[PDB]
Structure 1
């Protein structure tokens, strides 16, 4: 199990920007840290920005993927904390998309003094529907996703990428498709299974950090009522920022709009 030190190289850690305020950018499913490329220059004039790849990214050597360890999001949390501890960063804001929003929630419970603020993009505590809980998916829907991913990964990714982007932004579709195709198909399926089975509803109240939940007008994996649920149950002061754009990947499809929200959220913490 690589130390935080060795993880700095394995997970392609980069530190850029200037200033005292540290911000971690943690990418979502199907991308790598290049997904932050379009929004990054809106932060680096006056924030010190830490970027890294999740172990499941195609830009990480697939020989490092451990199918036992990473069948729970707690192992991804371990990696994040090991990087921050290796970098000797005692306090930061954290921006997470998708699975990284879940990682950030869990990390803020594991190490409450380390996270001054959480910004969650495309975030859900639970995708499966439950009693009086609308997450957006039934068990048979997620099973069909797994079956499609395993039977024909290329065809599944080609159909999924425009749905995830949502808006008619062809470069965003191409960029998301490229990193989706860069993932090894068995690792992609494994991460998808891990995310779809996670249920964080019972620990949201243990988050102490103030939070900004960024929600678009239509997100194929996150109903608007799930953003409200996060605001209702997160333990810190929480604001939902509604972005006037469609899709699950606003950092790819609407970076200037997302940047305005991020700069307001990261101005003071």
Structure 2
């Protein structure tokens, strides 16, 4: 219960099929609020907050521990194990997509399916590989994030949301601004330093790759990369949704696509 309490674990819904909804960067579990009504009636929905979420006591964010994705996988597995979940479908936005991938390699039996939203195994460019970002441009962003966090949020949130959906821009900004600035920077460094390309072939559960248009964080070719390199049966859903946070900006359409992927 103490981790379950610390990370605001919530189990809701009247169904028996277990569905884990795992928020990503800059949000908390409330990013799923508008998706939830579409699943509460026929799934048992598990939600939690990543340790870096603005909604979690920043005392739990231990900079000596959370230096890679692996301790975040530990937290997810502990939660699922504590709850007695021996199989689930798992939806991971942003960094939670990579967390779910790693968890699935550790525990191949735990996941029936992974649904990946706004996922990338690597943000940085490399030889054969377009991640979308150059090392140099990214140091400039880290400097701005350190120099003026509130301003960085206000410039970043419209790019992340992408589509002109002011309510979703304000909502993402709200949860980014709830994160302690040095946590946000450290998490961002952690993930820009991450490269999951080498482990994708180890995954054996089926993955549904949800890819929006003009995703600031994820070039189209990255979705194709995941499809070609994840080791199990993969399916790309090319969503008629613009931007990196489709659960915030287009929830109805996102929820219908999720239901389709789950029923596949």
Q: If the TM-score is normalised by the length of the shorter chain, which range does it land in?
A: over 0.9
Q: Partner of 2:177: helix, strand, or coil?
A: helix
- SS of match in other structure, 1:70: coil
Alignment equivalent of 2:174, drawn from 175, 178, 181: 178
Q: Deviations over 1:130-173 (max 9, x none)?
A: 11101101101111111111010000000001110011111101
| 1:51 matches 2:47 | yes
How do 1:1-269 residues align onto structure 2 when only pairs under 5 Å count? 5-267=1-263
Give the SS at the match of 2:263. Answer: coil
Question: Matched residues in 1 for 2:253 and 2:131: separation?
Answer: 26
| Cα deviation code 1:46-91 (max 9, x no counterpart) | 1110000000001100011110111100000000000000001000
In 2, distance between residues paired with 1:141 and 1:52?
32
What is the RMSD computed on CA atoms of the aligned residues? 0.8
- 5+ residue gaps, structure 2, are none
Find the aligned partners of 1:77 and 1:141 in 2 and give their Cα distance.
29
Shift of 1:175: 0.6
1:264 deviates by: 1.0
Q: Separation in 2 of the partners of 1:90 and 1:143?
A: 42
Number of aligned positions between the proteins = 264
Q: What's the secondary structure of 1:142's corresponding residue?
A: helix
Q: Report SS of the residue matched to 2:50.
A: coil
The unaligned stretches of length 5 or more in structure 1 are none
State the SS of the aligned residue for 2:133.
Answer: coil
2: CA distance, partners of 1:230 / 1:136: 15
SS of 1:31 mapped into structure 2: coil
Structure 1 consecutive aligned stretches of length 4 or more whose deviation exceeds 4 Å: none
